[PDB]
């Protein structure tokens with residue numbers, strides 16, 4: 001009931017980010033939503049004395065048809081004062097469920113002097129009327145201070161469930177609660193239904209699990225007949241992997257390509273060449289040497305489009321030091337829409353990153369800036385938004401992860 | 403009759419900055435006499451109030467004769483206070499576009515300019531608006547004044563005023579959804595499709611509603627001249643536009659970009675000045691000679707957008723709901739870059755038109771595009787980037803966008819294999835480019851004024867020139883791969899354009915990459931030849 005004093009970081013003004021265009025349906029949904037939040041006192045209209053702004057738009061979460069208000073607090077979160085633990089068990093758990101606990105934030109007042117920086121604008125079509133300007137009175141969904149400030153209340157609500165179930169790992173990131181287990185889904189959902197019940201006894205009606213390899217092994221072909229082209233591709237892949245792995249050698253394989261030969265011609269492997277290829281296999285079976293996570297440095301996520309709905313990704317902090325690699329093969333929403341697939345890949349990769357390290361990575365997207373910025377909000381279903389940059393030059397490496 | 407007050411808008415100065423302390427300029431006795439007369443009337447009207455000696459702030463006041471009508475006009479120069487006043491959320495950054503307006507049967511104008519001086523200024527801020535009328539012969543203390551209302555020329559006045567008018571009109575617009583109200587200058591524009599009797603009645607209700615806040619309305623005519631447009635009841639168009647060895651002064655005209663929104667086929671690619679410059683090699687569009695008007699928006703009909711390729715990285719589009727009646731038109735210029743193709747540019751035009759249409763009509767239009775469905779499918783399924791264009795249909799209006807070549811995914815059986823390499827000396831700018839093949843074909847060409855990158859491209863060109871219709875090419879040039887894998891159809895480098903022209907003639911091309919200096923036999927032999 002007593003607000004926590006919050007201030008921006010030293011030497012930084014409040015956010016002043018342009019509101020981007022919205023469709024009529026999203027504007028109509030945002031009006032209905034904000035009209036009701038106004039009556040509930042969560043937000044209040046503001047005047048021209050407020051120069052600050054944060055973009056707003058609308059989404060439909062997974063398996064629901066109801067519009068939800070999403071605010072892009074990325075700029076405010078950067079400039080918000082760092083407010084002063086990550087469970088390594090969450091990644092190791094067999095099954096983790098994700099719960100939207102954001103509505104809980106709306107029962108906590110926001111510091112009076114800080115409300116000015118939560119200002120948002122509902123745009124008008126064709127600029128025909130002025131924008132509807134609001135600011136928050138309660139803790140906003142998507143703000144980094146909202147979990148921080150609410151943490152004191154959250155532990156109190158969850159200590160009963162935690163004592164009753166100690167094997168359950170519980171983790172909170174933004175509006176999301178991550179609840180891990182090693183039990184069966186039916187009882188998992190039963191314990192999950194139990195957690196919601198505690199939440200109803202002050203909330204909304206995602207099932208995920210870890211996969212086998214953290215870093216997917218590099219694999220080489222096993223053939224009985226090698227063409228010149230097969231051996232050229234292999235030498236290329238091994239030269240690339242030699243930037244990651246120490247003792248990769250290609251001399252005995254490159255020697256087979258001696259002469260000016262037709263690409264489709266079969267070349268039998270020499271005994272020296274078979275041994276070299278086997279030693280490289282052995283090298284690639286071991287882990288990468290000296291790969292550490294540093295919480296100070298940013299995480300970097302790279303995505304390649306491999307075609308036919310397949311996508312590859314690598315998370316790292318230093319080049320050739322992969323903390324995780326993976327491959328996403330099917331996106332149900334879009335066999336005809338590359339951008340929907342990419343957007344769902346970014347969301348899956350961010351979720352995994354939240355589980356493993358408890359922070360989102362910076363993405364390098366295989367897309368032109370203008371195409372991505374036009375369409376990603378149409379397919380976004382998460383309450384957080386990561387950072388991203390754009391790759392304009394085709395990487396030669398796409399082959400090596402294929 | 404009690405009048406509801408206009409709630410003041412709390413204003414503050416920027417943090418750490420204090421108010422203005424500028425020097426009042428010496429005035430002529432005639433000007434001082436003119437200012438004293440004005441301010442006494444303004445004071446009698448409540449717009450300003452005389453202040454005592456306590457206020458330490460001052461803003462200079464000037465007098466300008468208005469068209470020598472034997473009358474003077476007061477001018478207070480708030481430039482300094484504006485620099486020290488807080489920032490505001492201005493709301494006029496985007497103007498409505500006429501093509502987004504809906505047709506209306508009746509549209510009435512009302513004068514609400516009297517409301518500007520009816521909007522109060524924050525009490526605690528008035529002391530910062532102080533100004534001094536100098537005394538005759540400087541023998542008395544000048545008359546001191548401060549503002550009680552939003553001053554003309556102050557930073558906050560435009561934003562505070564509109565936000566005040568909107569707060570006033572909200573009950574009326576909510577309770578009368580059968581009407582629309584737009585605010586331009588000192589006049590309000592109210593439109594409706596009701597019978598002329600009901601429309602005039604509701605205007606009387608608006609005048610009554612404004613009278614509650616004391617705003618009093620007096621007792622134009624279509625077409626309306628607004629923001630460089632002409633707004634007729636059934637059509638809209640731009641206001642007239644106007645254009646020698648003096649063209650050297652500027653390319654600010656040129657302003658055909660403003661015309662481009664309704665006049666089709668306008669081009670501005672002359673790109674001169676890419677303060678005195680030569681001009682040559684240009685075409686007068688001269689399509690501005692004949693009048694062209696746009697239509698208003700009917701939300702019950704579909705929105706359509708058709709794009710045409712005009713050449714030289716230029717694209718033109720029309721947005722319409724019914725055939726041959728255009729809501730608006732426009733153009734798109736290719737982005738500055740070294741290599742490009744038509745499919746990427748058409749994709750960027752689609753995205754530009756999409757966002758503009760969201761702005762103006764709140765929805766994406768259906769597209770008609772000069773590209774075959776099969777062409778687009780081949781493109782996006784094989785393009786290394788993710789791409790997408792919204793719902794669209796093919797229109798057979800040449801020039802048609804097409805794919806000009808497609809590289810093979812696998813080596814070609816029975817096609818000759820060309821191993822190419824190129825190298826140059828950084829100091830002499832001399833180099834070699836060449837190939838060796840599986841059939842024993844060879845070439846090495848000596849080159850002057852070249853780089854390692856140009857020799858790598860030239861070697862690929864040689865293999866393409868001297869090969870049959872089907873050919874396998876092995877290079878170690880990551881630079882050449884990055885270029886060809888981006889599928890350019892045109893380039894700024896004439897060497898890339900020549901490779902493109904050779905690729906268009908081939909039936910099958912497989913381009914394979916190998917690492918350099920690793921002993922790949924064909925690459926090793928040609929590398930020794932070209933690095934000599």
Ligand SMILES: C=CC(=O)NCCc1ccc(Cl)c(Oc2cc(Cl)cc(C#N)c2)c1
Nearest residue numbers: 503506509591592593624626628633634635
């Ligand atoms: C006579 C023309 C006509 O009727 N056009 C139909 C569109 C239309 C509808 C409703 C109104 Cl209120 C309107 O008036 C405006 C709008 C705007 Cl942006 C600016 C101005 C001004 N200066 C007036 C226009």
